[PDB]
Amino acid sequence: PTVEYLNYEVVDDNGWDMYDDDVFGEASDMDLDDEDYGSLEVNEGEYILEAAEAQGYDWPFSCRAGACANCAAIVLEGDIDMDMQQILSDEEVEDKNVRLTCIGSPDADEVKIVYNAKHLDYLQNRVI
Amino acid sequence: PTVEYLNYEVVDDNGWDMYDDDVFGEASDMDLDDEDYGSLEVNEGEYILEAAEAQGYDWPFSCRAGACANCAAIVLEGDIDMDMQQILSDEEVEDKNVRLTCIGSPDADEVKIVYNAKHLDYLQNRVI
Amino acid sequence: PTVEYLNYEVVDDNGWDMYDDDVFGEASDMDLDDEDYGSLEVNEGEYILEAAEAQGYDWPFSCRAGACANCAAIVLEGDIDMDMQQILSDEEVEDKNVRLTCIGSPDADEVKIVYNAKHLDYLQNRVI
Amino acid sequence: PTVEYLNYEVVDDNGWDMYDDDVFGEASDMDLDDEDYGSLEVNEGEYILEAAEAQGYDWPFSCRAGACANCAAIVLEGDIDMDMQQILSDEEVEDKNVRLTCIGSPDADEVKIVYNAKHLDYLQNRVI
Amino acid sequence: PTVEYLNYEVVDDNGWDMYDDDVFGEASDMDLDDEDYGSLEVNEGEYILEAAEAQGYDWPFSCRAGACANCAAIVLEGDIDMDMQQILSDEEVEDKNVRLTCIGSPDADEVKIVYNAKHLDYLQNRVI
């Protein structure tokens, strides 16, 4: 699969809303470092965080076990299949689109995420 | 959580349909062995197959890795959270309600399943 | 289970001895942050460190594999069941009550620990 | 470590009691197959079942996850360190000396077990 | 990757030698069941046994942990990357081309194996 990704700090510095602004289009016209914006090839069954790390991208994580929110990302297009986790609520998964990249792989041919979503205020209570 | 379970072979011997017949009510009036019908306490985060095995229930499995259909169950009420798996399609998960018990835990306080769902014909192609 | 916990740095700043002082009673009259003193609900089979992290508590760890002492805690009441580990001696487990929280779950309904026990001098040689 | 082992079916066929009879001495004068009596070299940290399997010994197991009793053994001398497990009670571990070989390694230089202890009647309720 | 595979029992029934006979060409002119001869798509990082099982192929395995020889295959073209294992010798890996399919993934775009190689006499001592 292809996961296009945008570091949440770029969304936050610009005052963008990940559903009203053309976050991926506008970050492609900037000159962000590759770990902050780009597209990543990720096999089905391959963890997104580990595909990012194998490109040398030091995306956030702490536990690597679905027991924190440090690796959270928001999926804007496509889907990410996760291992079992009890930290995110059903509403955070189904409506807020929070996925944990340490334990999630692409579930669609094309996925688009805003990673580093640990800075979202509702997730700050599970960030270690 | 409590997972009430019914072995699919009882549904199949009786010609029941798991959505039109009172499968759990009618199996409670029979005298099935406890591994074939009952309710199981399963912790959040605890695999349903392993909670069944720790009661001495030898529910079906082969791979234990989300790479076959031998541990499939159909969830009729509540939900089961699974580890990442590529063997079941989105339609099998979202519409047919197939969950793999070797890698799935209860995702709700009350869950009801028809286990041993590996005998369903559409899953016979992934049964090893 | 319920694990009541006290960060070892509070015991050490106060010159308390974890077996002569009323360490939990006295920390309950202070105004410590919740990660430093409180009670945690932890399922049987659930790692104590991961239950702490899912509350947003950034308790110490490095390896997460029972190969260091950074996640050590001293269990004062109840018990913690650990995965296999060769780093702690029998005397450290049976007499000094050292448990590794990254690989240990509650083994009793009520457990009381002094976590962050990596600062104990006899464990400083295995702290990374 | 060295784990000397005796298949429980030899103890049971002979009417021996694993604490009054010279079970290892008497099985050494028989002509059992090597998987039924012998001594096994097992590294610290190496699972006893997997050291037996790498000698081609097909010792019993089902789940390999500490969720059944099929791999049980009784440790008569030395000790076996296990991963976390909730299936055995404290009394079964501390007084009856039940260890699960799929998730246990030697915890002493010399260990002696009676494997295939799944045939003990008090464990028959967790045998799958 | 593509792994073309041939069940070793076909090689053995025909008196073929996996290095002098056109084992894959000749099995393609037979009418073997798909689990006995075919080509399998296997992701890098995906275990060959689990890719076979997800096609419903019940290829041999016992331990799934690199502690037996039941899942052995001989790689004739390309390579399979394995997890750490101590059961096979260097000569069995480098010269006899034995790979354990439960813990090995394709290491080349095109791989060709003769699976079910547990029937080879030199591996019979580690078959459980």
Next chain:
Amino acid sequence: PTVEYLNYEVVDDNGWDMYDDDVFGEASDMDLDDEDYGSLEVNEGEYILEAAEAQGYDWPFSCRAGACANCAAIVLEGDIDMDMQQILSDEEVEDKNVRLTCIGSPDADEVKIVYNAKHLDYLQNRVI
């Protein structure tokens, strides 16, 4: 096994070449801290990084999953058997002798490594 190890920063500060200089002999005449030069006993099947950490050596790592280069070491004598990994090329493994210590164990009775090899320029692109 015995793994003799030398921190790559000592090789780099001295302008040594790990194949022309007597890197281990010359570091033995210095007064490096034990984590920077010494010999480590590591069981077959035991990860080298975890054997180092259990001596209190805080050797580099990030992912612990074979998805980065932070734990790289160069093996100068003997060999290290690794779990499956897709981050290193065949040439990096076979010719440059790069091994990932988080997922590698000794594959020979005597092994000699230059750890902390993440500072090598060709590996800097996979260092997180």
